[PDB]
């Protein structure tokens, strides 16, 4: 992960034939290690990577060994280098023209691994080490969005966009507005005879690149085009004509992406800049002539049904929705999920109580620690007297006995109304018993 320097033990002449042979051979994992090790010093690293990339360039645009197999082998080798030690990606930042060459050399089969390669390359933007960000020639790469990709390729594209946002927000958004415009126009034109499965690629690309727009944010100048785009009556036409027919005709599995897209198109936000190291300030924009609220009120039942189908949508696409639409069941499941990712680090401690008074001993051994530790503590209960049930049963019975004891007659910390309880009066509650309420909390 750091630059390594040693004596130049290898002559620059032999590595040419060596890279030739590794390209002209198989079972090269060992050879991969050989090249990675010999490229330790800076000079050999630079010469080897430039030689390999020039060879790959000549393999495709310029063309025994077939050009395609040699190209895939060289791409695999480049990935194997760039992945480890993170310093062979730095040579791309050192040159910035070899990047232009490699991006230029990109056929249909290239993207399947070129996406991974470029995602790895994007590390040169993580440290912002470019020093020449004006001549990267990205519009070809952003235009290759029109090709056919997969899920992992999309993830690599997303992380590359996350790396390159602070550098090319203007031009990336400039292309994305037109791309989204043409995608929605295509969906609008074919909506009379649209298919959610035959053109499922269309809905995939639309929702994906709109999500990429969200991750990209919006600028001030493009706001005219953005407000134009948020006023497409394709939404109304679908939800009022095609949604009624596709509910009773087609499978909702391919129809759900359209609902995600409808959420996203109004989920568009406003990023001002990556002022801090790891984040960009986000501000919520507004819609003036939209009857989008009317639409979401119209099919609120379907919205809640689809949210119940998969709560994970709230963390990926459905995050822009208002919780008011959601019922308390889905909201509570989402709340449990949200509170359980920040589980933090959990230390394990023991707990000992007596059947005579669990509450008193629990209070005594729980006031000593802090809120964070007791929050993260794994209560391994040890009931005195009885040892016949597992730790989970011990904790369950400890909780039940605590619940019994806070409402016990002797404690009287809360007075009963029946099933429920309310805290006892200030006159009846002794001043020393107020800490018991903190313990209850």
């Amino acid at each position: 992960i750091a630059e390594r320097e040693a004596a130049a033990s290898v002559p620059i002449d032999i590595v040419f034939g060596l890279i030739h042979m590794v390209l002209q051979c198989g079972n090269r994992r060992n050879l991969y290690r050989i090249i990675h090790n010999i490229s330790a010093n800076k000079e050999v690293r630079i010469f080897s990577v430039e030689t390999l990339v020039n060879s790959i360039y000549q393999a495709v645009v310029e063309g025994v060994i077939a050009p395609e197999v040699i190209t895939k082998r060289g791409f695999e080798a480049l990935t194997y280098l760039c992945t480890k030690s993170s310093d062979f990606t730095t040579v791309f930042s050192y040159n910035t023209e070899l990047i232009n060459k490699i991006l230029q050399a990109t056929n249909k089969r290239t993207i399947s691994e070129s996406v991974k390669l470029l995602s790895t390359v994007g590390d040169c933007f993580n440290n912002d080490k470019v020093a020449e960000p004006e001549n990267i020639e990205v519009r070809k790469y952003i235009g290759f969005l029109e090709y056919d990709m997969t899920d992992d390729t999309f993830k690599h594209f997303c992380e590359f966009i996350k790396k390159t946002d602070r550098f090319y927000r203007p031009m990336y958004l400039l292309y994305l507005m037109g791309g989204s415009k043409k995608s929605l126009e295509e969906c609008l034109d074919k909506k009379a005879e649209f298919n959610s499965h035959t053109h499922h690629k269309g809905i995939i690309k639309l929702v994906r690149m709109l999500s990429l727009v969200n991750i990209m944010g919006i600028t001030e100048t493009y706001l005219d085009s953005l407000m134009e785009l948020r006023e497409m009556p394709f939404w109304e036409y679908y939800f009022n004509i095609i949604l009624p027919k596709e509910k009773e005709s087609l499978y909702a599995s391919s129809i759900l992406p359209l609902f995600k897209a409808f959420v996203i198109v109004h989920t568009i936000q406003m990023y001002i800049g990556r002022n801090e190291n790891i984040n960009e300030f986000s501000e919520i924009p507004n819609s003036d002539s939209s009857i989008y609220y009317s639409v979401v009120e119209k099919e609120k039942d379907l919205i809640n049904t689809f949210i119940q189908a998969d709560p994970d949508l709230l963390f990926h696409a459905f995050a822009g929705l208002q919780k008011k639409i959601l019922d308390f069941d889905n909201k509570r499941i989402y709340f449990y999920k949200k509170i359980r990712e920040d589980v933090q680090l959990r230390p394990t401690i023991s707990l000992m109580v007596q059947r005579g008074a669990v509450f008193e001993d629990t209070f005594h051994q729980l006031m000593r620690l802090n809120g964070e530790q007791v929050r993260n503590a794994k209560f391994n209960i040890k009931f005195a007297g009885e040892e016949g049930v597992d730790a989970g049963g011990l904790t369950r019975e400890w909780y039940s006995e605590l619940s019994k004891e806070m409402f016990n007659a002797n404690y009287a910390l809360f007075t009963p109304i029946g099933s429920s309880y309310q805290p006892n009066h200030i006159s009846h509650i002794n001043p020393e018993h107020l800490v018991y309420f903190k313990f209850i909390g």
Binding site: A6, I14, N37, A40
Partner: protein, 1441 residues
């Protein structure tokens, strides 16, 4: 097996293979019990081999025979069908070996073959999750290959098919529509599948279910390696269930099978249940049931459907959903609304009930609420009264059986016991009473279920028992009992349960005693037919337990029960003798199996049925009539019960057996009688040996006149048995004498071991026995005379003093008794009788010799315990001296009749004679006083006789006792010393000198006289004795004498010898002389031993046991090269190992023993080390306070001479190079001294090492050549690693890089050499220097150049390259990492008998460090001795120093 089963087996085996399918086709269904596959091994093997023959006739590879015989397909179709039929109701399916030929049937063009084979495979793989043992047969074929059939079957989906071929790295369409020739149209099976999909589609339904069955098989193998996702569950499962709904029976059967496969998976289970949609009242499976009941269905199809249904109810959530649908109401209405439904259909209904009623409790509660029990009662009444008054119907009877089982298991569970409220309210009593009053026409299982239900209901609430009682039910039970019981296991198993349920009412006990039904249970035990069943299950244990429960809870009629059981015992006793032995063996085994429980229980009231007298007489008569094997558990439990019987009353039992044996003695003399006595003493020996504690009264009975008289009569009878050889064989006589002796010694051991026995009480028995035996000894019958005297020898064995103190051999009480008998005179009488009969030439010298040895042992152990023997004390030699004189007379008499069989006893006599001396009971003073004693002269003349005997023994006999402690005293007389020295038994003298110093002092005078005979003595013992005598005398004279060695002068030369012992002895002599000369001034001149060294190297090429030779060669060369200061420093370094231990180390003995190597190597070094750097030795007086090698005097010239020897043969070159390795390891600085020119000769090592490649293993190899090359390379590796020189390494690396590119093998081997040059690191700084050099030399360039210049497109070239990667990968990684961490980098970041002996020995040879090498080199002179005299005198020196 079976009866019709055996007929089917033999018919399948023998019938012609043309008529095999026709006969097979008659087998339509399995209306019989399950079996084991072992009975069809012949049929399975025959079918497998005929299938193999057929498929080889077809080809199995390409299915060339497209026009195929219809007889063949019918044959294999029937084979697979009835194979499925057999295995679907079989056991031990893991042995099915016919699986090996089924995949060609799976991929066959014939679709009947494919459906049959895939159905069989699916059934076999169904039980993978349960049995798990059939996978071995399944593993014969690859499961992943069936993924070809995963693609769904469509109406000619694609006419193009893509195949994958390597190297070319392309996949393109193949021609399918051609089909011009049936030959050309792992990928072959996939292509055939594509052809079957495309070309023919008329019969696509069968292959449409072939794909389905293959999918099912891949489900069964592993559901993880399956395409199960949302799409499969959402499409194929609905398609399969639609097939079940609509399509025809034939392929909806396969759909049902695949549905079973799916739902047994238990994945996506909620989704599967919600999708399959039986939750509706018009759900699927009950809809199919409505069809089946309404529209007629094929019988086999109906059976498959109902088995699928039973599979459905088995799952928890499935039956929960089915019950929620309302199946209970459906079945209730179906039963209570129409009776015209077929009987078998109602049967299938009631199996469905038997499943779902017990699967879950909620349907049970609903059914109880729905009051379907009353409907069940009504239909049961209808079924029975249709059966009653009418002829027997098979289906009707088994349906009544189904009703009985459903009601019985419904009543069985207490959680299902809620139905026992409305029992009497219904008409159940009327129906069950009708059944009981007419049980003669019903299946026994019906009766068993009925009785179980009746008993369970009665036990549920015995309050209602009278209501049953006046219902006349028990009367019907009586009528049923009038009929004799059938061959039913479970009915007989459960009958005691109903009988006990009757005992719940006391009046029923009264009536059953009145009517005496228990006669049936009593008489059940003598039935051979039922004996098989009793063997099969645990009937005896159940009946026993029921008996104790009855007697304990209801002992009212216990007297009648006792009477009946004893009558049955006598009955079963009666017919034993006139019956086949095996039948009675097994029947008695079962009978005593249930006796084991029946009586002698710890529970109360069981003692009421434990009669010692009658049962004892019966069991004794039984044992006295039949022979019983020991290993059977029948033997075990009969032993147990007889032990309780005897423990209750020992006296009466022993009296009874005594009178029995006397009475049978009075009978006629017969062989079977002899066997009876044999077994009665067998049992008495058993009971005596097992007995731990004994009452004195039992011993009194043993010494009672009856016991002694019966024992003496037994002895008399045994003697009479020797009278006639014809009636009783001589071997039988020997065996009976042996067993009688064993019995007598056992009982004598018991009585003697018995505490505080009356002395005279023991004496009368023992003296009577011994006098009888000795009287019988001198009779005509001398055949058993040896056996009789061995018997008295064992008598001497047993009457032994406790000797509880360790190392104690003395009589405690028996000594006075023994010489109160005057044994010695009898012994001399028998001795002179033996001498005379020897003179009378009626004895073989061998038999006479063995008699002498036996009597010698007798005397030896007789005198072993006698006190103060040969002890000069005034009072006790009144008789002991007389016995000593007798012993001397006896041993003198038998002088010339001693051989190997007597030496041990005679030496034991010596050891007894000299106990005080050898066990040092003296203070070394009174022994030196008491020489003027008669005992001393007697023991001295005894030893004289002994030495005379020994010197009359050849080498073989002498080697047996070559190391005994007494020889330290025997040869103490210098007269005997010169006598034995002139007798040439010098090894004894060596051991004596090792252990005693006076004989060594005599040898000191002896040495100069024998110094001249050293040369060409050809006696290994003589020469080793010389060498060892010199080493001890030199190191002893170093202790304050220093002068003795100076007086010795001479010169010795050696002649050629072919015996290896001679040459190695000469080498050892050279070792001693040079090792003494280098330190001490010796006047014996010796030439340069190199001549002897090359003699050794020549002879090892031929001789065996090379270890001593090679080790002596290595130690001698190191000794010659090494010097005094080096030896002293090495000894100090070695001692530092135990010096740093700071342990207790209180005794000097441990110090010496663990450092004997330092003791022998140089006493001066060890002495000065202990005087200066004294150890943590307590020394017997408190404790003492405690607290890069450069060597000089070496001889590199000999190393230089040796280095260029260049021998010819294999083994001597190996020896030379091994010596080179040891010296360079020991003294690397010698290499720094070599001539700058000589390094040219390393080409020899490099080339002869390049002869073999261990990695690339070739055939026609030689293991000795392999180890030669390995050692050659080891030399170079040691040069690079353990040495710190630079320039020589530079030269040799230059040479190796020059020689590397010569050829592929040279490149590979030198690359390896560089690799493990770098890997094994002796030191970090040395390794850093090595890395600096190897980087400095640019070797990577030339090695990689030779690497890619030679790269050829070859098959094993890949293996060569992957081998080559490791060295260059390692070195390149080293050259990248910094120098500090590079050191820590690591990898991956009787010709045959002697041949094997030498193969193992070569690997046994290893690199020996200094420590164990020195230890073993001084081991030769130490001869594994634990303490020599030099050690003692040196320890005294250390103490006084």
């Amino acid at each position: 097996p079976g009866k019709q089963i055996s007929n089917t087996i033999k018919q399948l085996s023998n019938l012609p293979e043309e008529e095999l399918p026709t006969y097979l086709n008659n087998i339509y269904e399995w209306r019989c019990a399950k079996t084991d596959l072992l009975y069809w091994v012949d049929v399975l093997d025959r079918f497998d081999e005929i299938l193999k023959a057929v498929v080889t006739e077809y080809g199995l590879g390409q299915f060339q025979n497209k026009p195929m015989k219809e007889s063949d397909k019918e044959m294999v179709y029937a084979i697979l069908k009835f194979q499925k039929l057999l295995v679907e109701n079989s056991s031990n399916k893991s042995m099915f070996s016919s699986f090996d030929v089924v995949e060609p049937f799976i991929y066959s063009f014939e679709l009947d073959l494919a459906i049959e084979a895939l159905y069989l495979v699916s059934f076999f793989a169904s039980k993978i999750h349960i049995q798990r043992s059939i996978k071995t047969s399944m593993a014969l074929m690859k499961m992943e290959t069936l993924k070809t059939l995963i693609e769904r079957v469509k109406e000619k989906p694609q006419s193009m098919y893509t195949y994958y071929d390597e190297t070319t790295n392309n996949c393109k369409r193949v021609s399918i529509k051609k089909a011009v020739k049936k030959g050309i149209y792992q990928e072959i099976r996939r292509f055939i599948h594509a052809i079957r999909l495309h070309e023919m589609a008329e019969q696509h339904e069968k292959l449409k279910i072939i794909r389905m069955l293959a999918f099912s098989a891949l489900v069964y193998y592993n559901y993880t390696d399956l395409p199960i996702d949302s799409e499969f569950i959402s499409r194929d499962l609905p398609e399969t269930l639609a097939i079940i709904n609509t399509e025809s029976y034939q392929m909806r059967e396969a759909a049902v099978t695949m549905i079973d496969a799916i739902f047994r998976m238990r994945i996506r289970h909620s989704a599967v249940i919600a999708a399959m949609n039986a939750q509706s009242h018009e759900g699927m499976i009950m809809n199919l049931l409505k069809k089946v009941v309404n529209e007629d269905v094929p019988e086999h199809f109906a059976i498959v459907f109902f088995n699928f249904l039973s599979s459905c109810f088995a799952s928890g959530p499935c039956v929960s959903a089915l019950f929620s649908a309302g199946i209970v109401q459906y079945v209730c209405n179906t039963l209570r609304d129409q009776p015209d439904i077929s009987y078998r259909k109602r049967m299938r209904l009631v199996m469905g009930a038997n499943t779902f009623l017990f699967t879950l409790p909620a349907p049970f509660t609903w059914f109880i609420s729905e009051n379907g029990i009353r409907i069940l009662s009504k239909e049961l009444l209808l079924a029975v009264d249709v059966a009653l008054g009418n002829i027997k119907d098979h289906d009707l009877l088994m349906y009544i059986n189904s009703i009985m089982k459903i009601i019985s298991q419904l009543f069985k569970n207490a959680g299902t016991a809620e139905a026992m409220r409305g029992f009497l309210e219904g008409e159940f009593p009327r129906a069950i009473s009708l059944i009981l009053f007419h049980s003669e026409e019903f299946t026994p299982s019906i009766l068993a279920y009925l009785f179980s239900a009746v008993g369970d209901y009665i036990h549920n609430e015995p309050s209602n028992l009278p209501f049953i009682i006046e219902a006349g039910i028990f009367d019907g039970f009586v009528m049923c009992m009038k009929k004799e019981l059938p061959e039913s296991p479970d009915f007989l198993l459960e009958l005691p349960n109903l009988i006990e349920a009757f005992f719940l009412n006391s009046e029923l006990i009264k009536k059953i005693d009145e009517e005496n039904i228990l006669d049936r249970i009593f008489e059940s035990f003598e039935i051979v037919n039922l004996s098989n069943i009793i063997l099969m299950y645990d009937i005896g244990r159940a009946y026993g337990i029921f008996l104790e429960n009855l007697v304990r809870h209801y002992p009212i009629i216990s007297l009648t029960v006792k009477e009946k059981i004893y009558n049955t015992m006598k009955n079963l006793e009666s017919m034993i003798p006139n019956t086949d032995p095996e039948l009675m063996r097994l029947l008695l085994g079962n009978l005593f199996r249930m006796m084991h429980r029946a009586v002698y229980r710890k529970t109360t009231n069981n003692q009421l049925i434990t009669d010692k007298g009658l049962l004892n007489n019966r069991i004794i008569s039984m044992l006295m009539l039949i022979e019983i094997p020991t290993e059977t558990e029948l033997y075990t439990d009969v032993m147990n019960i007889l032990m309780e019987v005897f423990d209750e009353d020992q006296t009466y039992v022993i009296s009874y057996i005594a009178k029995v044996i006397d009475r049978v003695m009075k009978n006629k003399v017969t062989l079977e009688n002899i066997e009876k006595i044999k077994r009665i003493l067998l049992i008495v020996n058993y009971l005596i040996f097992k007995n731990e504690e004994t009452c004195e009264e039992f011993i009194k009975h043993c010494t009672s006149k009856g016991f002694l008289q019966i024992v003496k009569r037994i002895s008399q009878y045994f003697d009479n048995l020797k009278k006639d050889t014809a009636l009783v064989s001589v071997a039988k006589n020997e065996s009976l004498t042996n067993l009688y002796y064993s019995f007598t010694m056992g009982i004598l051991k018991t009585v003697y071991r018995y505490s505080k026995t009356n002395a005279k009480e023991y004496l009368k028995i023992f003296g009577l026995l011994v006098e009888d035996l000795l009287s019988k000894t001198e009779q005509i019958d001398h055949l058993y005379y040896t056996q009789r005297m061995h018997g008295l020898k064992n008598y001497i064995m047993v009457d032994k003093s406790p000797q509880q103190y360790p190392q104690k051999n003395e009589f405690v009480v028996t000594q006075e008794y023994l010489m109160g008998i005057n044994l010695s005179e009898t012994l001399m009488e028998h001795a002179k009788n033996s001498v005379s009969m020897l003179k009378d030439e009626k004895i073989t010298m061998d038999a006479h010799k063995k008699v002498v040895s036996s009597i010698l042992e007798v005397l030896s152990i007789y005198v072993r315990g006698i006190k103060n023997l040969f002890v000069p004390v005034k009072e006790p030699k009144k008789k002991v001296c007389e016995i000593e004189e007798h012993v001397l007379i006896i041993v003198e008499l038998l002088m010339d009749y001693i051989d190997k069989s007597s030496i041990e006893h005679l030496l034991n006599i010596v050891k007894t004679a000299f106990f005080v001396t050898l066990r040092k009971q003296i203070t070394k003073e009174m022994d030196r006083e008491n020489e003027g004693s008669a005992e001393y002269k007697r023991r001295n003349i005894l030893g004289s006789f002994f030495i005379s005997v020994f010197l009359n023994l050849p080498k073989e006999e002498t080697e047996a006792v070559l190391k005994s402690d007494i020889f330290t005293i025997l040869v103490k007389n210098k007269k005997t010393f010169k006598q034995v020295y002139n007798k040439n038994c010098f090894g004894l003298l060596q051991y004596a000198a090792i252990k005693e110093s006076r004989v060594f002092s005599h040898l000191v005078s002896f040495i100069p006289k024998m110094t001249k005979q050293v040369g060409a003595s050809t006696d290994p013992a003589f020469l080793k004795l010389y060498a060892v005598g010199l080493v001890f005398v030199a190191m002893r004279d170093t202790l304050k004498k220093t002068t003795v060695l100076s007086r010795f002068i001479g010169n010795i030369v050696f002649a050629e010898s072919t015996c290896p012992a001679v040459v190695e002895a000469q080498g050892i002599v050279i070792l001693a002389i040079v090792k003494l000369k280098i330190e001490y001034n010796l006047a014996i001149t010796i030439e340069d031993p190199i001549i002897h060294l090359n003699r050794i190297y020549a002879i090892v090429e031929t001789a065996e046991q090379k270890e001593g030779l090679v080790i002596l060669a290595n130690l001698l060369i190191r000794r010659v090269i090494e010097s005094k200061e080096a030896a002293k420093e090495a000894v100090d370094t070695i001692i530092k190992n135990k010096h740093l231990g700071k342990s207790r180390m209180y005794t000097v003995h441990t110090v010496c023993s663990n450092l004997r190597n330092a003791l022998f190597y140089s006493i001066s070094s060890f002495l000065e080390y202990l005087s200066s750097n004294f150890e943590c030795i307590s020394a017997g007086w408190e404790e003492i306070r405690h607290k890069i090698k450069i060597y000089s005097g070496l001889n590199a010239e000999l190393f230089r001479t040796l280095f260029v020897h260049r021998a010819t043969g294999k083994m001597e070159q190996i020896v030379r190079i091994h010596s080179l390795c040891l010296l360079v390891v020991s003294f690397p600085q010698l290499i720094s001294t070599l001539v700058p020119e000589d390094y040219s000769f390393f080409m020899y090592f490099l080339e002869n090492h390049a002869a073999y490649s261990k990695s690339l293993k070739p055939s026609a190899f030689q293991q000795e050549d392999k180890t030669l090359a390995y050692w050659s390379g080891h030399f170079i590796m040691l040069i690079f690693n353990h040495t710190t020189y630079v320039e020589v390494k530079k030269y040799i690396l230059e040479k190796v890089l020059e020689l590397l590119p010569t050829s592929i093998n040279a490149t590979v081997i030198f690359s390896e050499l560089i690799q493990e040059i770098l890997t094994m690191r002796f030191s970090k700084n040395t390794f850093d220097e090595n890395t600096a050099l190897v980087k400095e030399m640019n070797c990577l360039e030339v090695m990689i150049r030779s690497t890619m210049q030679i790269d050829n497109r070859r098959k094993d070239y890949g293996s060569i390259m992957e081998i080559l990667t490791k060295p260059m990968e390692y070195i390149t990684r080293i050259l990248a990492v910094d120098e500090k961490e590079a050191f820590y980098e690591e990898v991956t970041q009787q010709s045959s008998s002697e041949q094997s002996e030498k193969n193992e020995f070569l690997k046994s040879l290893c690199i020996l460090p200094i420590s164990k090498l020195i230890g073993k080199e001084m081991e030769i002179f130490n001869a594994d001795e634990r303490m020599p005299f030099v050690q003692k005198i040196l320890e005294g020196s250390i103490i006084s120093n």
